[PDB]
Each structure stands twice: as structure tokens, then as C-alpha cells.
């Protein structure tokens, strides 16, 4: 089966080892994105367990986490702060986490993913992401 849905606007962050806890962030944990209302600077990171072929059959690879603005993505029906394994919530100063933006999600056939930057910090050392130029 091929997932039919829309995707995250940003690249993934990726754990370096198996069974890593959720990412902790210096600063808001909200990706750099100047094209949003300050009131709308809030969302969640969502865990994605990965695999790939290796010896015998399939082989576990470290988790990826993907960021979605509140009210969008797989956990669109969740409200900011709602507890669920594999969901961590982030908000920048001045955010109103009741607000809902028009950003929606990314259609992969049309737009490439945005590069991740965190001018106010970034995730802890259990995590890394690929370089994509600005």
C-alpha cells in the first residue's frame, strides 16, 4: 500500500540509535518559518518508526520525527498539549495554541520539503538531520 495523504512541510529529524526517547529542544522546537503569523507558531513532532532491507528480511532503522502545525497532519484532530505516545508539542513565545492556520500539509508531487533550521536552538544530540541548502 502507498500512503495517499499529504506530507510534512519540513524534512525529518532522525535518531542516531534505536529506541531513542522523544526529542527535547533548546528553544521553542518550532522550525524557522518567517511566513507564518506569530500567533500560529505552534505544532507537534510525530514519531515514525522506520525499517529497511538487510540480513534475512527487514531491519529496524532509527526513528524519524516530522513536524506539523496544530490541526494538520495525521494528528490534526488532536488539540495542543494532548498526551499520546510519539507526539510532542511545541510553541514559540507569542503563540496562541488555540489558533488554526491555513498552512495545511504538503502535496509531495508539487512542492519539495523545506530545510530545517532552529535559530533559537534545535533538538538534542540524540538527533540529526540532512543538510539542504537555504
How would you describe this structure to a colleague?
The relative contact order is 0.35. The chain is 0% helix and 28% strand. It is built from no helices and seven strands. The protein has strands at 13-15, 25-26, 42-53, 58-69, 87-91, 122-123, 127-128. The protein has 134 residues and is mainly β. It has one domain. A five-stranded antiparallel sheet has the order 5-3-4-1-7, with no helix packed on it. It is found in: Virion; Host endoplasmic reticulum-Golgi intermediate compartment; Host Golgi apparatus.
Layout of secondary structure:
Layout: E1 13-15, E2 25-26, E3 42-53, E4 58-69, E5 87-91, E6 122-123, E7 127-128
Sheet with most strands: strand arrangement: 5-3-4-1-7
* End-to-end separation: 33 Å
Structural domain tally: 1
Number of strand segments:
7
PDB class: nucleocapsid protein
Keywords: nucleocapsid protein, phosphorylation, RNA-binding, viral nucleoprotein
Assembly: monomeric
Entry title: Crystal structure of the N-terminal domain of IBV coronavirus nucleocapsid
Write a compact overview of the structure shown.
It is classed as nucleocapsid protein. With 134 residues, the chain is mainly β.
Primary descriptors:
viral nucleoprotein, two-stranded antiparallel sheet, 28% strand, 134 residues, RNA-binding, 5-stranded antiparallel sheet, monomeric, phosphorylation, mainly beta, globular, nucleocapsid protein, 0% helix
